[PDB]
């Protein structure tokens, strides 16, 4: 009945889109333990841009936040097969090809981003009435 | 056994100094229930300062926080007798006179802040290498 569950990502100056997007992934059966991982900082600066915490600094943010139950710190960059099988992982949940093999095998669970509501946007919300 | 604290505060921009208070104000005893208080808009402005985010952006992202158990929001500006009756609060947990009377009830529990780990200073991480 318990369902593992795995989401990665940078998770870079976690914001509220963040922490909906593990709900979501927390709450898609009944029973589940949410795996998370995060991506390394070399990984991310070669393949994504600029990160503006370290690998443990966005670990540790993780650790305060409800819907986490279990953390993989630094995570591989791309999902395999055969990380599925060696940490039992029964769907990889993420924004919604490079998750179509996911989705032919039934694995891939969709999870919602929410705009407008990172850390970013507040610091311009400030710098708007100044 | 179980034993029900309370933590007010802005909780503006929560980061990971908040968080680990609020672990702290759970982790007090064994058994606890922790109730976070949320200050409102108004009196946040008229007594604090400048806020950012908005009381219902405020006590959203607590929502969140794996420590949180109960939320009051709004909460009073001022911890009163009659609030710890009215809502069974056996310890009142804060960063450390307006809590001498909670001191010499036996009702305060200390936490502590983190300096260095604020939104606002991450921000300055950014533009020092800008």
Avoid at 11 to 22: I, P, S, T
Avoid at 40 to 59: A, I, M, P
Avoid at 98 to 114: E, S
Wanted: proline letters at 2%.
């Amino acid at each position: 009945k318990n369902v593992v569950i795995y989401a990665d990502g940078v998770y870079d100056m976690l914001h509220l889109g963040h922490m909906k997007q593990l709900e979501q992934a927390k709450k898609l059966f009944e029973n589940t333990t949410l795996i998370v991982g995060v991506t390394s900082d070399n990984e991310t600066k070669l393949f994504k841009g600029q990160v503006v915490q370290t690998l443990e600094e966005r670990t540790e943010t993780l650790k305060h936040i409800r819907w986490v139950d279990e953390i993989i710190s630094p995570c591989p960059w791309v999902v395999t097969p055969e990380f599925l099988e060696k940490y039992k992982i029964d769907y990889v949940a993420h924004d919604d090809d490079i998750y179509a093999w996911l989705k032919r095998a039934g694995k891939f669970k969709a999870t919602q981003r929410t705009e407008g509501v990172s850390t970013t946007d507040l610091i311009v919300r400030i710098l708007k009435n100044y």
